[PDB]
Design an enzyme around this catalytic site. Sequence first.
Site, PDB file in Angstrom:
ATOM      1  N   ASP A  75       0.797  -1.219   0.000  1.00 61.52           N
ATOM      2  CA  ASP A  75       0.000   0.000   0.000  1.00 61.52           C
ATOM      3  C   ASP A  75       0.837   1.281   0.000  1.00 61.52           C
ATOM      4  OD1 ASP A  75      -2.140  -1.802  -0.016  1.00 61.52           O
ATOM      5  OD2 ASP A  75      -2.577  -1.570   2.117  1.00 61.52           O
ATOM      6  N   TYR A 107      -9.431  -1.445   1.350  1.00 63.59           N
ATOM      7  CA  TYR A 107      -8.995  -1.104   2.723  1.00 63.59           C
ATOM      8  C   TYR A 107      -8.998   0.390   2.992  1.00 63.59           C
TER       9      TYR A 107
END
Lengths: 620, 620
Positions: A290, A374
């Site tokens: 990420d 997410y």
Amino acid sequence: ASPFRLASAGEISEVQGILRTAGLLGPEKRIAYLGVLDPARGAGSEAEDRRFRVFIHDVSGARPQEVTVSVTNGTVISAVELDTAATGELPVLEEEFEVVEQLLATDERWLKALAARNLDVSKVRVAPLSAGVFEYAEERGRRILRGLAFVQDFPEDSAWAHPVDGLVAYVDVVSKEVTRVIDTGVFPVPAEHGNYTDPELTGPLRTTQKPISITQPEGPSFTVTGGNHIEWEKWSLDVGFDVREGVVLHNIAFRDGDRLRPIINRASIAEMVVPYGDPSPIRSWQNYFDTGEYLVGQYANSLELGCDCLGDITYLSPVISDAFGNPREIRNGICMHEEDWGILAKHSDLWSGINYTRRNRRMVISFFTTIGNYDYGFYWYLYLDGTIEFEAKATGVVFTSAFPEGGSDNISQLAPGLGAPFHQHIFSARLDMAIDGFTNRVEEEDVVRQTMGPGNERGNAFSRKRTVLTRESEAVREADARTGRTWIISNPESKNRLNEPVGYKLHAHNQPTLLADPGSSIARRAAFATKDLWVTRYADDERYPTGDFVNQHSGGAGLPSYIAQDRDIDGQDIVVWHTFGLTHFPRVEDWPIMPVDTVGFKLRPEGFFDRSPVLDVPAN
Amino acid sequence: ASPFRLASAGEISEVQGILRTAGLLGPEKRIAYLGVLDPARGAGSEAEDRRFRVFIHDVSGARPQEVTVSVTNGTVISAVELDTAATGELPVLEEEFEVVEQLLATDERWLKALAARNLDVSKVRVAPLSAGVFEYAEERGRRILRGLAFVQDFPEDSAWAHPVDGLVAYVDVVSKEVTRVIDTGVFPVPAEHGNYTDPELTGPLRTTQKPISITQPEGPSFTVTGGNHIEWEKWSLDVGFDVREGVVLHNIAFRDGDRLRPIINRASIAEMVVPYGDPSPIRSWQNYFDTGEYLVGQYANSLELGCDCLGDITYLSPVISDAFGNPREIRNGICMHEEDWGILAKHSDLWSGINYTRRNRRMVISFFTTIGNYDYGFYWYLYLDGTIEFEAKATGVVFTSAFPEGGSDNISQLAPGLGAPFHQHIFSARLDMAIDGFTNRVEEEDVVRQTMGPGNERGNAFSRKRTVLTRESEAVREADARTGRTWIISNPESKNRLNEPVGYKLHAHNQPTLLADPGSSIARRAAFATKDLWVTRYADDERYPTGDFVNQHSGGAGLPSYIAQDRDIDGQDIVVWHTFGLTHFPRVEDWPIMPVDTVGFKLRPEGFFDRSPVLDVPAN
Ligand code: NI
Ligand code: NI
């Protein structure tokens, strides 16, 4: 102002000009990363040189370039072409997000797979997933994105409720070719919707929650000067923001009476990886960095008052560059506020008759980012007593799959036919230490049990042992919760009044580290995640545990390489890299939207002060 | 009303009357412990039968008695005379605390020791401490307290700053005799004061802290009925209070739709032990069971609004018995309030365009107690998502000693010549489980690493394994942080919609357990503290992990004896006993008054609900 001030819109603009007026910026050129560089190691630096590092992509397929410009001087300091097959690909561009779905929509292999499942192509969302590095020889040098399909019944429908298993496509995003489409077999597409705002799902909303009002009639106790400089209850620091790391803390210091004592030079979450443990070939390549591949700062949410940050909030709106070098502001992207933290200290003494009670408080610096399914909240806390803490809050919608008939050892069931592949969310906090200055050292402290016998006849004795990590080759440490293992960072040349080196102790949560087989691709690409604590000698080019170009990088790129230098870390300018994460076996309770799960670490003063630093806090 | 209601003043006075009437409470008798018993195991109960258990001490030396009376029926259910040398002495009486210093003040051996140190007896305070069980044969059957001296320079001086090392005395508090005075040699008595309210030490108080006001304009969201029945955001429970255990939670349940589903029948901190790791004969016998020996509940502080409990607080003022059976109220001894708990769930979906954010909250039930130099806060939390958590907060003043000239492996230095012997604060949470009823089982869950190869070609797979604990003999478990070990309590006869047994997962902090040598007196007396988790078959007489009588009692009672029964716990009425604690190597920052240190555990739903239980939470 301060050499640590946040990047200005004008500075971003000036970078754009500089690149343009040099032939670096133009037609098929896209800025994959842009961020201000931190000042170099110095004390009497009375000459400000604001430099910016930029990663420039070429749509045509030409070689990308790493360029460092000097905005103060309006110049190009360096510009190098990158051999991506050697050094790794550039960060995924936001504009390439749609591309995987678009290209696949006209692919006959794809359309055929959808037709077999009776799925309307116009309702099939495709996620632009990082590729990693596996056995596909043709991918080396090419900028690939993998895609997994999720059916979206209508515009406001949550597609995650409808994963299309047994199918995965690989796409070359520059040549615009669907390099592959794999269909291992048809799996029922879960039918239930996961629309958490749908009254049929939510039911009648609760009317039982009475308001909790948090106010500060006199304003907050912290001051913000020079745009991002914070002064709060003896604490002093500068709140930076980087498109890759997100919120970065600079010059964390504590005013101990007459001295502004440094503690941490720079604190950041230098990497964040989400490895999946499902051996299905549809998802076994799945590992999302990420921070490294997608750039979490880029996707920071605009936090709303009263919903995201409650109480007296002071916001920072960081400015970033778009793909063309134009400045873009992330309105209310960072929340700054102080919150009550219960009891700080308390004692009702019989002998003196004195009853004493003091309240604790913590300064909070946070932001929230969204990376596909997410959503992560990153929180930094500074406490009255000198404690520094970080906490990551993981929420969002779980990444789904089909739940195999006959169960699974690597996927859990969320709803009928709906599965959630096991995964982890592992973080790396990079702590450029400055305990009372740069001459630091790290010791691993274990609780020591003692045997009953001579000198310990009652068998009640217990002690502690500290081992100094002298060279980087001995600075790759693992947790040992059983013996209460912690790591102390001290300054061997700065003693407290009891003549002991001042220090700070890092308390880890001792959560499991990377579970993947050591010979796995992810074990090599995210080697940092296989150990709890790493200590390296500071170097301006050693910024990330996974290296500068994570996307499709072969392996061993960051920490393992730095550590190989085997530099002296005993009483030197050092950096602590703490790996910490969550291991997820999703539950029914995580569906349709998951409640926050947390993880973090903290550092507490360990003989840093000459006595408690909170004796001057009043009853108010 | 409810049989779980708090003891009223009238009930305590009635117990006194019933005891008096039965000839069990004459003038030489003292109530060492008095508490209401929980309703017997059953369903169809024929009306109320409020029973009270009492431990009766006799100041003239006669054998004490354990008695149960039915306050409802005005009868004595049972009364048995106790052989303390065999089964243990009764809890320390508050009145016996002052006896130690008083008796020593006229003892010539004590006076000689003080004279050798040039200390005025009128200024020497004596900390009256539990004796434990060692090699002093003459102590068997007698009520002994040991004494360690601390100099108090003036009425409001903190004596802990001035420990008198090299000296300890043992005192029979019944016959009122000093049995032994041990002097191993003089040690300098630390001179610096530790007066945290002395402007000379605190320095000018901070004027920088601005107010943080927490209010609830419409009152709190929880309701209190029947005196102690709480209903909040789907939760339901009764807040009881026992003089030994302190706050005890009864019938914790969650309103899932039309079903009020039980989760935990009873939750309490059933024992606390504070062992010291200094092998000096002056302190090597030092171990207190604050709960078992002193009864933490009787020492609960009266909490101040705004100081101890900030916000909209609802107080309970529990009533306990004094030494004579008269009722005594602990005014505002329990705080009840709900607090904001940041983000509950959040997701900004690209595909749907829906941005969702919900806030979390927790119900808080707490009390703070003071036992000598230590002050402990006990906090129970109930969260919106179904999570249950306990947190202990340890503060007060550190127990001091002299700091040995040539340093120490078992004591740390706080100030010049002032030491802090190493110790632990270990708790035992007794959780009488009722996951959707009493038919429960416990499984130990470890993360499972998989080898790369056939079926896991990319070496990314990872799994989980659960081992059911079937008999008590296999239910004594240890932590394994490395493998993410947790324990799941489920009801094998109640399945969620996905046909999996409902459950709750216990997440421990994995802190070091009892460090003392396994052959030590403390390892046997605090056997429960040597293991992280124990599971027993419910029995109404198995209340504490250490037995009913801990004071000067050797091993032979508690968990090790219970477990030997090797009862079936696979789908039965079971009880989970979790050991969790703090290991302290005091630091300079802990002097002159300790900032709060915390430890705890939590239980999160694991397939208990059919989907997230917080979808009905309003935006607000
Ligand atoms: Ni997750
Ligand atoms: Ni302590």
